Write a protein that binds this ligand. Sequence first.
Ligand SMILES: COC(=O)[C@@H]1C(=O)C(C)=C2O[C@@]3(C[C@]2(C)[C@H]1C)[C@@H](C)CC[C@H]1C(C)(C)OC(=O)CC[C@@]13C
Ligand SMILES: O=C(O)CNC(=O)C(=O)O
Ligand SMILES: [Fe+3]
Length: 277
Amino acid sequence: VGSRTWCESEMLFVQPDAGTKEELYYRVTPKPGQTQANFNWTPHKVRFHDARPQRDSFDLNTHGFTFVEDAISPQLIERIRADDTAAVEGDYFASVAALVKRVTGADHVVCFSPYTRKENSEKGIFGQPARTVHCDHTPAAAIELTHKLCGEDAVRLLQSRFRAFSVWRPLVEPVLDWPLAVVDGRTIAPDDLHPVHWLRYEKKDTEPPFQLSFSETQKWYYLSRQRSDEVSIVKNYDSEVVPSPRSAHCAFKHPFVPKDAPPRESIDVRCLVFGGR
Ligand SMILES: COC(=O)[C@@H]1C(=O)C(C)=C2O[C@@]3(C[C@]2(C)[C@H]1C)[C@@H](C)CC[C@H]1C(C)(C)OC(=O)CC[C@@]13C
Ligand SMILES: O=C(O)CNC(=O)C(=O)O
Ligand SMILES: [Fe+3]
């Protein structure tokens, strides 16, 4: 069930055949009588290798994710936990942009779609830990988001290196239950990716993310006891040919934490990244 540098748990994948018949969709809030989806979630046992022994060796180009040290003020943390929208869109956005610039040397970072999450929150499934394995954007979604958020500069910006990141930070520390797991992007096969339209409304409103199916080739990681100063940067898209075109991420129930542990809290924001290495 567990060892010194790894443990076992479960995450919700999709079937390895899913999406070959027709386009997959999932309704967030189906009305009574409305079919919620044309596919089933399927849990699968996964071995989560602790990244803590090798924390600094993980790379956005090689693995598709990285862990970086970046302390922010306690006052900003409590403002974020207090659902201060101005604190998120102002100071924290600026924090995330500066961090990504530090890490990648990019010329321009655009933050969007912040999500503050709490174990068994009351803000819905997007304010709660993610239980389905996913990559936030397909190529079509990352490209669309660039036009949506950059307007006239989109074509100019897309002539250079274009990446999309999920930047994840714990709000209470250390993270024990429901940590954010990440997979080595070199161990994702093309057949593991399945676009799924997430219908927050009646009809499809954007381009879709990827959901993953399980493979034994996948090498899954987590950073045990992650602290508020340890930031996870997970690559959702990359326009350059690198060993990891993308990573994927999801949370899992840790089998060795007390039942009465306090709820996991965190904030993740997405960002478009132009330039850099
Ligand atoms: C429990 O839901 C999750 O596990 C994930 C999640 O928590 C969130 C917040 C999501 O945002 C998505 C899809 C995911 C990754 C889901 C799968 C949808 C639901 C709304 C915002 C869009 C958007 C920003 C317009 O960009 C898109 O490319 C379309 C897909 C996302 C990224
Ligand atoms: O925090 C979680 O459980 C899930 N987070 C994400 O999917 C993300 O950062 O894109
Ligand atoms: Fe995500």
